[PDB]
Structures are given as structure tokens and as C-alpha cells.
């Protein structure tokens, strides 16, 4: 049941409104141990773990239950925002059953943004049918400028994760990101929302990225509106 799902979504979006909101902004919770990360990761396994699922997590690694589902956990999307005061952060998860992906959410607590990825049935925001419109994130740390040259404006919103969702929204055009920094524990819910939604994800190279059950892994993300845009930035 993705009903099941949804409940366990709601309750730990109500969970990290209550608990982990009151940190926006605090320069404590970017003491080392990330504090403010770790307290997000407690939050969302002390609810998830109870189920006996598998988790894939930055903090935990992989913890196997030999389950037919395995949860994708990223419990603070946009870290370094949320302790600064910048308000672009988000917590998601990314649900499969063995490997398909059956239900990803991105929340944005800022906005109260409730994003969806239902594979057979498409992309949702806050319930209702979102999809990519007819201007991209940009992240580099030396390749593309030819891109910059290119292109009428670009974001660096430092939430991936959060970028990817605005895309699926029509925010925005394509989420371009040409480091291999990102690991898919930030990027798979915002990839099946987004390809929920008509995006094209493919990756460095110019095949469909995939995505792997390890937080190891580090991509590159070029996700985008249309072919032309798509074949451009290739």
C-alpha cells in the first residue's frame, strides 16, 4: 500500500516540524560529531527501523534486514543551508520494493511543500498532478562555462535534492551538476519525482542514471526539460 507509506511520510514530516525546526538557523547544531544531521538521522530511523526494512543512509551505511523493501533515507538535504538560515532544505525518502521504486517524497519545510513520485500515476504536489514546463540549477567545480555562456540564468540553491523537486514542479529547467560529489542517498526521491514528472536523467556520459542501494556511490546529475536542452548541454 503506498496509503501505509503516505501515513509513515506524514508522521515523520509532523516529527521533523516539531523536533528538528526549532535548529533553522542555530549555529550549534553544526557542531561535529554534523549534530543537526545526526538528530534528523535518530528521528527518521527510530521510526523506520521498527518496520524491518533495509535503510540505505549517509550516516549508517546500509543496514540489511534481508527485506523485500529497502528505504532511502537522506534526513537533512541542504545541511550547511539549514545551519546557516538559508532556507532551502529538505528531508526525503525513497521506498522500493526489491528494485523497483514504488513511492519517493520530497518535503520542504519552508514552503510546507509536500512533492510525490507514485511510479503509474506520476509526480504530485500537495495532492495534485505536477509536471515539467515547456533556466537551470548549475553545479561545477571547473567543467561546463560553456554551459554558464549558454543558458538565460542559473541557481545554486545547495540542496539538490530540493532542486531536482522544483524542476518536477516547472521552477525550473534542468538540474545540471558536473562534479561527482553527489551520492544517491541525496539524489534518488528527487529522481523518481522528477522522471514522475517528465524529466530526463541521464548522467555525464548521456545513458539513464541508476540508481544503486549504497550511500558510496558519487554521480553526476544532468536532469532536464526536453531533448533539445538535453542534447545541448551533451
Known amino acids: 500500500k503506498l496509503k501505509f507509506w503516505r501515513e509513515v511520510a506524514i508522521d515523520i514530516i509532523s516529527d521533523f516540524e516539531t523536533t528538528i525546526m526549532p535548529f533553522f538557523g542555530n549555529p550549534d547544531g553544526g557542531k561535529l560529531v554534523k549534530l543537526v544531521d ?3 538521522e535518530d528521528l527518521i530511523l527510530s521510526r523506520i527501523t521498527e518496520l ?10 546500509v543496514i540489511d ?12 538535504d541542504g545541511s550547511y543551508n539549514f545551519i546557516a538560515g538559508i532556507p532551502f532544505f529538505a528531508l526525503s525518502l525513497a521506498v522500493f520494493k526489491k528494485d523497483k521504486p514504488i513511492y519517493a517524497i520530497i518535503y520542504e519545510p519552508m514552503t510546507e511543500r509536500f512533492f510525490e513520485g ?10 495534485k498532478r505536477i509536471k ?3 533556466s537551470i540549477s ?7 562555462h560553456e554551459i554558464v555562456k549558454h543558458v538565460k540564468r542559473t541557481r545554486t540553491l545547495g540542496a539538490i535534492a530540493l532542486e531536482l523537486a522544483y524542476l518536477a514542479m516547472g521552477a525550473l529547467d534542468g538540474v545540471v551538476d558536473v562534479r561527482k560529489y553527489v551520492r544517491p542517498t541525496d539524489i534518488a526521491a528527487g529522481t523518481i519525482i522528477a522522471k514522475e514528472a517528465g524529466a530526463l536523467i541521464k548522467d555525464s ?19 532536464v526539460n526536453s531533448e533539445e536542452l538535453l542534447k545541448t548541454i551533451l
Open 205 to 223: 556520459a548521456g545513458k539513464d542514471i541508476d540508481i544503486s542501494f549504497n550511500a558510496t556511490d558519487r554521480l553526476d546529475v544532468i536532469a
Open 132 to 134: 515539467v514546463r515547456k
Open 52 to 61: 524491518g526494512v533495509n535503510v540505505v543512509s549517509e550516516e549508517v551505511g
Open 138 to 144: 548549475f553545479y561545477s567545480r571547473g567543467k561546463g
Open 118 to 127: 507514485i511510479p503509474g500515476e506520476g509526480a504530485f504536489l500537495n495532492g
Open 38 to 40: 545526526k538528530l534528523a
Open 65 to 76: 534486514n534481508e527485506s523485500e523493501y529497502t528505504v532511502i533515507v537522506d534526513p537533512l
